[PDB]
């Protein structure tokens, strides 16, 4: 019994890349026309992408010309698509089917499909950071030598722009490189240390700017 | 460029009945189609091809005709493994194009929803997460369409549903939508509202709940 | 001049797949041996496959042999990395590098390198639900007929089961298909219909039975 | 099969010296070596070939020599641009291995972290998230050991930790541990501790607080 299965199924943001993979069990891709179909939420089907033996054509859908690419693997009887600048339209789950029948011909049906992947593009392209603040212990020393900072939580993609009193604060600064949760999403830290002598005279406030949401955040971090 | 236009969208029969599908083709593709039947969650099933060819293996209670523009598909004695979708398919050498599909469920009268609503759970909200559930219970036929107003402010964007398939012994479906927001988001407004819509009505149904009643 | 970039990298859980991808800018692959690699967190370089001109030899590194499979596209200078069944350990900086040099010889060194695409296995393979009554209304009609149901929240991968009171309880009961949260995560609701005239008298019990991450639990649904 | 064998791990040094990495191979491999530079983020940069062959383009500062199962790569008159992590390589035919790589740092003076914790803000934590953050502040040498310990016992598999790159002016690094909890869980202890190890301190040193103070 001819089988294929899909591989590489899973969430993305709109805008991102996901590569699928296609393998098969007893036959040999290579005298057939292999194809890409997916399966949209209201139920219909849609032709994606097809390439012929021997790579000697391959055509899309007029949705993801440009976008989608489509390689196939003879030796070792994979096929592949490659989908990129993802849509919130492109979510489906993805078939891959040979083109074939009892004998060949130059124009057969799709004889034999996988049983689908699941691709999934989420709306937002881009989220804003949440700012918390790394308010300075209160039993730091007397005299000088203070920490204190923003928390940057939960935005995306890279990267974020931290700035601390606009500026006019730059000596001790540590901006730490963000670092992937396990949500998706990125987080970083910015400290600085400052003399203990100088909370509630000198007043503090990270600016942080996440360029690819356009959102900017000013946190004012005081004591306690 | 060969747009295919499948119909009906829906099909309602019962067991036992011969029934048609039509497919037409915005140009002629002489016998270059195919009929595909899918079950939910599985994978199409190649049943005809060349507009009138069977595949072998597939019963012979299935039949397809027509050349040119005009395509039928018939399953003539209806029985219970054959309610699924059907899919006409215009292919060529190196593309296809499909049509849009056509369900064939079991008939029956038409029946409005029950409708429930369930606020968040105490220990869900201790979490920081608000999950409310409208239910809409045993109706027909399958198209129905929930509201949620939140202070009678209309929401989208942040819900999710999911229809059961037609019940065993009613021949009814179920929905079920799941709005979700924050422990913040949720304690800002006070009255939660998810407004039904459905053939079976003489208008739309409001169930709705006030936070912390 | 001549450049490489990588598609594909993402968030994966343990025993996930990810298919990745390798396109270049001014120049053929056709005459070059085309090679991945990772660099660990460690900060240290592995070797991770190889896939000769023509295809005709497909080298791998032990950690990954039987999980990953390379694959060239000579045509449209593409090449690929399937990555099955991934561990921890495959968390990484992954690049793609070709074999050549000025003259090309029998054995040349990586000379062009891409930028890199991060991947990122994390630990669990799965995750148990969590269970939320959904407890029926207090203004119920009066006479029968209320409803009450579970809600199984926030597990991975897909299936759970659920009966109510062991199985005694099968009429009148709706278990939902799953859906996927934009988190990453499932979740589903199970509901029966009951006689309004039964509450305080008998007890409804969801039994759930999430099998990938052997976990069990049953919750009581009371009412207010 | 061959195992390679970069010496040293991190090699400390300064502006203008001469400096050597060691590359061994568990066999030989006749002159099958290449050296590559790499900088945080970016992509390697091919040196050396053929164990001791210039990269058009390479400044003649970097040299390598050996043959059979010694190599070394010097740089004579080390400059800022090249403080980075280099990797040797034995490259065949169709598969290659790399050693574990050599860090070339600026070498200064031992210095013990300063340490600091910062409790979650109230507003994070309603949302039912909770997040500890550790600071260690210009340290030296780069490894440090950071461990959580929540009411004295050891947490594992719940922090992440990031360190900044050697400092342009005092050639320290820098370093934030983060604890993330839910609100639930985060609320279930009372004593947050944050133990830190490092070749300058005399011994551990563990700043905690009391979780509502």
């Known amino acids: 019994e001819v089988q294929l299965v899909e591989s590489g199924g899973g969430l993305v943001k709109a805008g991102g890349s996901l590569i699928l993979s296609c393998?098969?069990?007893?036959?040999?891709?290579?005298?057939?026309?292999?194809?890409?179909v997916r399966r949209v939420p209201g139920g219909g089907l849609e032709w994606?992408?097809?390439?012929?033996?021997?790579?000697?054509?391959?055509?899309?859908?007029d949705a993801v010309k440009g976008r989608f690419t489509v390689s196939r693997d003879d030796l070792e009887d994979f096929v592949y698509l490659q989908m990129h600048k993802m849509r919130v339209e492109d979510t489906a789950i993805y078939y891959c089917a040979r083109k074939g029948s009892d004998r060949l011909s130059d124009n057969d049906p799709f004889d034999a499909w996988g049983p689908g992947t699941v691709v999934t593009v989420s709306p937002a392209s881009t989220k804003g950071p949440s700012v918390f603040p790394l308010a300075p212990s209160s039993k730091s020393t007397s005299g000088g030598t203070a920490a204190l900072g923003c928390l940057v939580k939960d935005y995306f993609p890279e990267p974020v722009t931290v700035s601390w009193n606009s500026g006019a604060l730059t000596s001790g600064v540590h901006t730490f490189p963000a670092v992937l949760q396990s949500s998706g999403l990125y987080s970083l830290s910015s400290v600085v240390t400052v003399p203990s002598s100088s909370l509630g005279t000198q007043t503090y406030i990270c600016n942080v700017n996440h360029k690819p949401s356009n959102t900017k955040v000013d946190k004012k971090v005081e004591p306690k | 460029d060969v747009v295919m236009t499948q119909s009906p969208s829906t099909l309602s029969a019962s067991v036992g009945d011969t029934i048609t599908i039509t497919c037409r083709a915005s140009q002629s593709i002489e016998t270059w189609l195919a009929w595909y039947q899918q079950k939910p969650g599985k994978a199409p099933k190649l049943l005809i091809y060349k507009a009138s060819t069977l595949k072998t293996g597939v019963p012979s209670r299935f039949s397809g005709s027509g050349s040119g523009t005009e395509f039928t598909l018939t399953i003539s004695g209806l029985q219970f493994d054959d309610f699924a979708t059907?899919?006409?398919?215009?292919?060529?050498?190196?593309?296809?194009?499909?049509?849009?599909g056509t369900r064939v469920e079991i008939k029956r009268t038409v029946a409005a929803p029950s409708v429930f609503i369930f606020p968040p759970s105490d220990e869900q909200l201790k979490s920081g997460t608000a999950s409310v559930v409208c239910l809409l219970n045993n109706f027909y036929p399958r198209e129905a369409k929930v509201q949620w107003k939140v202070d009678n402010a209309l929401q989208s964007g942040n819900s999710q549903e999911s229809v059961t398939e037609q019940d065993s012994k009613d021949s009814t479906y179920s929905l079920s939508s799941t709005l979700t927001l924050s422990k913040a988001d949720y304690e800002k407004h006070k009255v939660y509202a998810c407004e039904v819509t459905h053939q079976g009505l003489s208008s739309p149904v409001t169930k709705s709940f006030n936070r912390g009643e | 001049e001549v450049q490489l970039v990588e598609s594909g990298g993402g968030l994966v859980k343990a025993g996930g797949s990810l298919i990745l991808s390798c396109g270049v800018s001014?120049?053929?692959?056709?005459?070059?041996?085309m090679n991945w690699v990772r660099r660990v967190p460690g900060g240290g370089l592995e070797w991770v496959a190889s896939?000769?001109?023509?295809?005709?030899?497909?080298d791998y590194a032990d950690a990954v042999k039987g999980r990953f499979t390379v694959s060239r596209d000579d045509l449209e200078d593409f090449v690929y990395l399937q990555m099955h069944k991934m561990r921890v350990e495959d968390t990484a900086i992954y690049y793609c590098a070709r074999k050549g040099s000025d003259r090309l010889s029998d054995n040349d060194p990586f000379d062009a390198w891409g930028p890199g695409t991060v991947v990122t296995v994390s630990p669990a393979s799965t995750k148990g639900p969590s269970v939320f009554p959904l407890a029926p209304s207090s203004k119920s009609t009066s006479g029968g007929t209320a409803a009450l149901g579970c809600l199984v929240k926030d597990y991975f991968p897909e299936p759970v089961t659920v009966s109510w009171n062991s199985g005694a309880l099968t009429s009148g009961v709706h278990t939902f298909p799953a859906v996927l949260q934009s988190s990453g995560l499932y979740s589903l609701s199970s509901v029966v219909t009951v006689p309004s005239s039964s509450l305080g008298t008998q007890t409804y019990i969801c039994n759930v039975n999430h099998k990938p991450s052997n976990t069990k639990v049953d919750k009581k649904v009371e009412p207010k | 099969d061959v195992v390679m064998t970069q010496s040293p791990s991190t090699l400390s040094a300064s502006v203008g010296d001469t400096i050597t990495i060691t590359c061994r191979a568990s066999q030989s491999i006749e002159t099958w070596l290449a050296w590559y530079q790499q900088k945080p983020g970016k992509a390697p940069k091919l040196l050396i070939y053929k164990a001791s062959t210039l990269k058009t383009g390479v400044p003649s500062r970097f040299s390598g020599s050996g043959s059979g199962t010694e190599f070394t790569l010097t740089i004579s008159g080390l400059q800022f641009d090249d403080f980075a992590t280099y990797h040797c390589?034995?490259?065949?035919?169709?598969?290659?291995?790399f050693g574990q790589g050599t860090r070339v740092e600026i070498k200064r003076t031992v210095a013990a972290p300063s340490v600091f914790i910062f409790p979650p803000s109230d507003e994070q934590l309603k949302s039912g998230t909770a997040s500890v953050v550790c600071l260690l502040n210009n340290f030296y040498p780069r490894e440090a050991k950071v461990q959580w310990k929540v009411d004295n016992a050891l947490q594992s598999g719940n922090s992440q930790e990031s360190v900044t790159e050697q400092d342009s002016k005092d050639s320290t690094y820098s370093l934030s541990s983060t604890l993330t909890l839910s609100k639930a869980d985060y609320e279930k202890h009372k004593v947050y501790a944050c133990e830190v190890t490092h070749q300058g301190l005399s011994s551990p040193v563990t700043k905690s607080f009391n979780r509502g103070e």
């Open positions: 001014n120049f053929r692959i056709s005459a070059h041996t």
């Open positions: 390589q034995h490259y065949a035919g169709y598969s290659a291995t």
């Open positions: 896939i000769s001109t023509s295809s005709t030899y497909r």
